[PDB]
Each structure stands twice: as C-alpha cells, then as structure tokens.
Amino acid sequence: PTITGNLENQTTSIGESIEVSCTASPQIMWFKDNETLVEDSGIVLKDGNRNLTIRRVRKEDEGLYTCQACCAKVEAFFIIEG
Amino acid sequence: PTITGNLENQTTSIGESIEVSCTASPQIMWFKDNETLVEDSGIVLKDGNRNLTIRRVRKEDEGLYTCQACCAKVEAFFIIEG
C-alpha cells in the first residue's frame, strides 16, 4: 500500500513508446479503463509486472491506466496525439 | 561468413510479432528493401544485433529483410496478412 514511480498523465505521438512503472511496498496489477490490461504484442509487462511498456502506440491505447497494489492505486490518463 | 538461425520467409497477421535471428561465425547488420533498417519503437535489435523483433506489425513492415555478416547474407520476405 505504498506505491511509488512514474505513473503520470501523458501525451505521446502515435507510433512512439510509453514506458511507465509502479512499485509497491505485494503483487502489482494493471488496468485500462478499469479493465484488466489485455497484453498484446505491443504491450509488455516486466519485473514482477512493475514496468509497463507500449510500443507503436495507436489511438486505441488512449485511456485511463491504473496500477493497483492489493489496497493502493495510482491512475493516469494517456493521450495519443498526431 | 557462416550465418545460421531462423531468417525465413514468413507471414504474420497484422498487430502481431515477428521474432527472427541471424548468428555469424563478425558484426551483424540488417536491411529492409536493401536499406538500413530504420529502428522505431516497434523494431528492437538485441544481443549484438543478432535478434530482430517487430511488435504490432503493420503493412509498412512488409518487404525483404536481409541480415548481413561482413561477407555472408540471408534474405527473407515478410508478408503481413489480415
């Protein structure tokens, strides 16, 4: 229940990358628009699911991303420009 | 001048991944349509540039990919279906 690390609102140009992370002082879980983050070839979780990377961001990536430690939470909205 | 590893022609559905590699018995370099492989957020070289990964493949990824050891070569054409 003590999350730290760079989950902040943010804007990215289409076709680029977003790299964020949460670290808790338990198991970290991720949501997009309050639903479990569907991993796909461009979405890669690392290191106990603390690092989230999205490659070749497209419009469908835009939304509200939550990283939860289970109970603490951080939310951030991602805008895809261009 | 002795390249080995899975550079073969291949078909992939749009939005998926391609993972190939060349390994020489010198420095490995990669081309697409005989031009230097422009790295972008979806194109990641690893391990001395022996592993090539493309995430969230799109139509523009389609083409002829060469891995050169400098002098040996392998070529493979990649079709993006769907």
UniProtKB/Swiss-Prot annotation, chains A, B:
The second and third Ig-like C2-type (immunoglobulin-like) domains are sufficient for VEGFC binding. It is found in: Cell junction; Endoplasmic reticulum; Cell membrane. Belongs to the protein kinase superfamily. Tyr protein kinase family. CSF-1/PDGF receptor subfamily. Disulfide bonds join 22-67. Tyrosine-protein kinase that acts as a cell-surface receptor for VEGFA, VEGFC and VEGFD. Plays an essential role in the regulation of angiogenesis, vascular development, vascular permeability, and embryonic hematopoiesis. Promotes proliferation, survival, migration and differentiation of endothelial cells. Promotes reorganization of the actin cytoskeleton. Isoforms lacking a transmembrane domain, such as isoform 2 and isoform 3, may function as decoy receptors for VEGFA, VEGFC and/or VEGFD. N-glycosylated. The chain holds residues 667 to 756 of 1356 of the full protein. Homodimer in the presence of bound dimeric VEGFA, VEGFC or VEGFD ligands; monomeric in the absence of bound ligands. Can also form heterodimers with FLT1/VEGFR1 and KDR/VEGFR2. Interacts (tyrosine phosphorylated) with LFYN, NCK1, PLCG1. Interacts (tyrosine-phosphorylated active form preferentially) with DAB2IP (via C2 domain and active form preferentially); the interaction occurs at the late phase of VEGFA response and inhibits KDR/VEGFR2 activity. Interacts with SHBSH2D2A/TSAD, GRB2, MYOF, CBL and PDCD6. (Microbial infection) Interacts with HIV-1 Tat. It is linked to Hemangioma, capillary infantile: A condition characterized by dull red, firm, dome-shaped hemangiomas, sharply demarcated from surrounding skin, usually presenting at birth or occurring within the first two or three months of life. They result from highly proliferative, localized growth of capillary endothelium and generally undergo regression and involution without scarring. Detected in cornea (at protein level). Widely expressed. This is Vascular endothelial growth factor receptor 2. Glycans are attached at residues 9, 34, 51. It comes from Homo sapiens. Residues 1-79 form the Ig-like C2-type domain.
